[PDB]
């Protein structure tokens, strides 16, 4: 056994020969650092008993345990393998207990399979009998993708483990963590996964969400595949240089999906096809959001709002944190500190702005005849709380308002209750969206106000290396009881269930509107319902750098609307950091400056009406807003097809191995390259320029760099922004709100490729109605340039914007001087103004009016 291929048989303690011998494993203390001294023997685990049986979907096999040591308790003697050839690109297999029903994730989107095996499979499945192994190969090149034969199958009631070899070290995914880099360190590394209230820092702990998806780029051809484990129990993922990955979980079942694609993007599309594509957001959510913990008073909030508005900051959304509430209790506001809250809501609305309020799951149990608290009374009446293990008594914990009960969002009735609470509150404060927080669920006491009983749920035979090392730390007892089951099994599903229930509530509170939901805790599929922010970061240069892979990873998980707290939540933010963070932050798909309690102000206009920071912030935010039709179309593609929004360079340039570990730059979709300065004191960035024609966004000039590392000069007022030749970018003159901005003239940026051609698209709908895509009430158009000719084609034309929108400017990059510019509408002509910069090779066509929704040909000569 090559030492990189050793599968650690002692994950639970310092390795000894005595434990090694008791477990029947192999002992060799002479490897390098982290090489397991004790590893599994070559035969051990399960064997296929009898023949595989063909089914309509695929096949089943009976696996029988080869007796061995009972290390982590009650082992499963007869295992059923059920394999389903679900589509040409998606293989599904599950290992279950043959004679006992086990917990299986009650996912809202994913349905059980009742089909016939798909035809024309891009993969082949090979089963070995003695001992059991499952292998999934790519048919085209027989590349082994999944191969369990590197280690055993382990299947005890509270310890399940399967490993797979990997075809490369190009592995991206898993969460929620601060991985610091984007390409996984396949050196010996364990990542624990269990939804936990913890700090995203340099420690690499489990965080707020649970994301088992990873994608592997096989080689420079782009061939890629992905793996998803459908399991909501505590677990860890062990990575090793074989290269190999081991999933180690403490309940449920091993329910695996293997996705094949021809590109990394297609793998993400295959994954999101299964778990659920992200919601199309409200167009205003794409705007800049402003927030802080503890304005303290409405007057303080109003003062921040008005200095930023006075600064002409693009600024769509104001968030109200727990200081709006009466003593930190849901569905109230402070009648003294926040007196006039409803009038302030009207002010926001009249300014073209939106209010997002924070809401917490945990509900104060402090209610009496003399001082009723409605949310609690109404919730008790309905019996929708999480119960202690007796199954009848609501579990009592402690969060912001003191002692609290916790809604059971897995109960359908709880969503009815939750909806009515929002209905009643909306009648008082007309908020536009909801920020759901602390929904892991988080508890200021461990378990409950009286702790948790010592038992196998609260104290299991094996605990993954989760922060603190106890499941119940800062959350509910594992034996707590809910509709979908015991907390042990469904803990990782609380934030997901809460997002589902909050979207249900939006059906009533915001009829036929998308609204906006921001969630802390997530599970696979939460993007269908909500955006995410990366939690309680810190105002440091490390945190600025770590933001990028975290953003890219959530785009793989199908939560493309993701970003950090710009400028850093904890700590006073240095001006230079916040300036660079705001430059970068204008390009996070979710863009919010948020600040923790008590720290110095970090809202852009607090640095000075004339400061370099405010000026730069406004500049790059005006650029973000200009490119909102482009961003919005990318979200339309993420919603309808499953594309990423913030995208790794390698997803576009996978043929180029120099892009495989790039995590300090990213793309918006296929065509905009963002290069932030990420280092203190720096006015330069060491950057990678991919294999394409690139144009400086502001000047339009073609860079001379192609396929190489560069020192990009980026003074304190700049971030690198380049447009990819070959792409057409729809724009819209910006305003301080998207309400206003959406009524402005549009533009096209045509960045020509080496062949003087370019292509693009634009999606347009009302920007807020739910179902516009499903119901085909939208405009979709395509732009193509092939020497001397721009064509605007209309493929879907069932929405006409009432604001007479039209492209009134076309900027062509990398062009020779255009002459005789003709504009035809269905072949019918019809002279635009043409301005030309011979040094830069930029033409701008103005005095033109291409109505959104109409087909045109713009023609020119040279
Ligand atoms: C919690 O207990 C109440 C009775 O107090 C009951 O009506 C409800 O069904 C219980 N919920 C669960 C998940 O057992
Ligand atoms: C920008 O928005 C304001 C409202 O705040 C509006 O009055 C103004 O006319 C808008 N700009 C354009 C170009 O219409
Ligand atoms: O509402 C109080 C704070 C917010 O300011 C913060 O963004 C959020 C984090 O999840 C925790 O720090 C708790 N929440």
From Swiss-Prot:
Disulfide bonds join 9-25, 20-38, 567-578. It is found in: Apical cell membrane. It comes from the Eukaryota. N- and O-glycosylated. Does not undergo intracellular or extracellular proteolytic cleavage. Acarbose binds at residues 197, 321, 520, 536, 594. The active site is at 437 (nucleophile), 440. Glycans are attached at residues 43, 203, 365-366, 387, 615, 657, 735, 793, 820. Broadly expressed. Highly expressed in small intestine. Expressed in granulocytes. Residues 264-645 are annotated as: Maltase. Residues 1-42 form the P-type domain. Monomer. Belongs to the glycosyl hydrolase 31 family. This is Maltase-glucoamylase.
């Amino acid at each position: 056994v090559n030492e990189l291929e050793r599968i650690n048989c002692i994950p639970d303690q310092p390795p000894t020969k005595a434990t090694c011998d008791q477990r029947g494993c192999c002992w060799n203390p002479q490897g390098a650092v982290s090489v397991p001294w004790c590893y599994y023997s070559k035969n051990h685990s399960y064997h296929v008993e009898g023949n595989l049986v063909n089914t309509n979907a695929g096949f089943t096999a009976r696996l029988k345990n080869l007796p061995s040591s009972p290390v982590f308790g009650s082992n499963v003697d007869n295992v059923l393998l059920t394999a389903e050839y679900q589509t040409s690109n998606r293989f599904h297999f599950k290992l279950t207990d043959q004679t006992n029903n086990r917990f299986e994730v009650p996912h809202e989107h994913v349905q059980s399979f009742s089909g016939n095996a798909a035809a024309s499979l891009t993969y082949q499945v090979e089963i070995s009998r003695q001992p059991f192994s499952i292998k999934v190969t790519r048919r085209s090149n027989n590349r082994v993708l999944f191969d369990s034969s590197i280690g055993p199958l382990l299947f005890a009631d509270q310890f399940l483990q399967l490993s797979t070899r990997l075809p490369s070290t190009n592995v991206y995914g898993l969460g929620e963590h601060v991985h610091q880099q984007y390409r996984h360190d396949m050196n010996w590394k364990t990542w624990p996964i269990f939804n936990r209230d913890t700090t995203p820092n340099g420690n690499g702990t489990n965080l707020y969400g649970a994301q088992t998806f990873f994608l592997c780029l096989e080689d420079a051809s782009g061939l890629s595949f992905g793996v998803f484990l459908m399991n909501s129990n505590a677990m860890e993922v062990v990575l090793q240089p074989a290269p190999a990955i081991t999933y180690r979980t403490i309940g449920g079942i091993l329910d695996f999906y293997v996705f094949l694609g021809n590109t990394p993007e297609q793998v993400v599309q295959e994954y999101l096809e299964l778990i659920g594509r992200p919601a199309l957001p409200s167009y205003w959510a794409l705007g800049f959001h402003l927030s802080r913990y503890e304005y303290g008073t409405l007057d303080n909030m109003r003062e921040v709002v008005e200095r930023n508005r006075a600064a002409q900051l693009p600024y769509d959304v104001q968030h109200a944190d727990i200081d709006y509430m009466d003593e930190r209790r849901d569905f109230t506001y402070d009648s003294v500190d926040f007196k006039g809250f409803p009038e302030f809501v009207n002010e926001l609305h009249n300014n073209g702005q939106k209010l997002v309020i924070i809401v917490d799951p945990a509900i104060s149990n402090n209610s009496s005849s003399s001082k009723p608290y409605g949310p609690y009374d109404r919730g008790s009446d309905m019996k929708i709380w999480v119960n202690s293990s007796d199954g009848v008594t609501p579990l009592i914990g402690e969060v912001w308002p003191g002692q609290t009960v916790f809604p059971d969002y897995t109960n359908p009735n709880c969503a009815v209750w939750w909806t009515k609470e929002f209905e009643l509150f909306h009648n008082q404060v007309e908020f536009d969206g909801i920020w759901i927080d602390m929904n892991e669920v988080s508890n200021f006491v461990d378990g409950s106000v009286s702790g948790c009983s010592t038992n196998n749920l609260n104290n299991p035979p094996f605990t993954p290396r989760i922060l603190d090392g106890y499941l119940f730390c800062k959350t509910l007892c594992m034996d707590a009881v809910q509709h979908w089951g015991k907390q042990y099994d469904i803990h990782n599903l609380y934030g997901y269930s809460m997002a589902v229930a909050t979207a249900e509530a939006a059906k009533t509170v915001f009829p036929n509107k998308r609204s906006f939901i921001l969630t802390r805790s997530t599970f696979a599929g939460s993007g269908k319902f909500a955006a995410h922010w990366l939690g309680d970061n810190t105002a440091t240069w490390d945190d600025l750098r770590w933001s990028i892979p975290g953003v890219l990873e959530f785009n793989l998980f199908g939560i493309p609307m993701v970003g950090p707290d710009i400028c850093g939540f904890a700590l006073d933010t240095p001006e230079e950091l916040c300036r660079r963070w705001m430059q970068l932050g204008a390009f996070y798909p979710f863009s919010r400056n948020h600040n923790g309690q008590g720290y110095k102000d970090q809202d852009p206009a607090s640095f000075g009406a004339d400061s370099l920071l405010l000026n730069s912030s406004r500049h790059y935010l005006n650029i973000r807003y200009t490119l909102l039709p482009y961003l919005y179309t990318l979200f339309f593609r993420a919603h309808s097809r499953g594309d990423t929004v913030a995208r790794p360079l390698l997803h576009e340039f996978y043929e180029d191995n120099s892009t495989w570990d790039v995590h300090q730059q990213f793309l918006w979709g296929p065509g905009l390259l963002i290069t932030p300065v990420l280092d203190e004191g720096a006015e330069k960035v060491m950057a990678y320029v991919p294999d394409a024609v690139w144009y400086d966004y502001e000047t339009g000039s073609q860079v001379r760099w192609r396929k190489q590392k560069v020192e990009m000069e980026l003074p304190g007022d700049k971030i690198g922004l380049h447009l990819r030749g070959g792409y057409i970018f729809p724009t819209q003159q910006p305003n301080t709100t998207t309400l206003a901005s959406r009524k402005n003239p549009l533009g096209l940026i045509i960045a020509l490729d080496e062949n003087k051609e370019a292509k693009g698209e634009l999606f347009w709908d009302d920007g807020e109605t739910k179902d516009t895509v499903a119901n085909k009430v939208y405009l979709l158009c395509e732009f193509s340039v092939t020497q001397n000719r721009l064509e605007v084609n209309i493929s879907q034309s069932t929405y006409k914007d009432p604001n007479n929108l039209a492209f009134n400017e076309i900027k062509i990059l990398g062009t020779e001087e255009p002459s005789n510019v003709t504009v035809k509408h269905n072949g019918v002509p019809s002279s635009p103004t043409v301005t030309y910069d011979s040094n830069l090779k930029v033409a701008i066509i103005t005095d033109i009016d291409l109505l959104l929704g109409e087909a045109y040909t713009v023609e020119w000569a040279h």
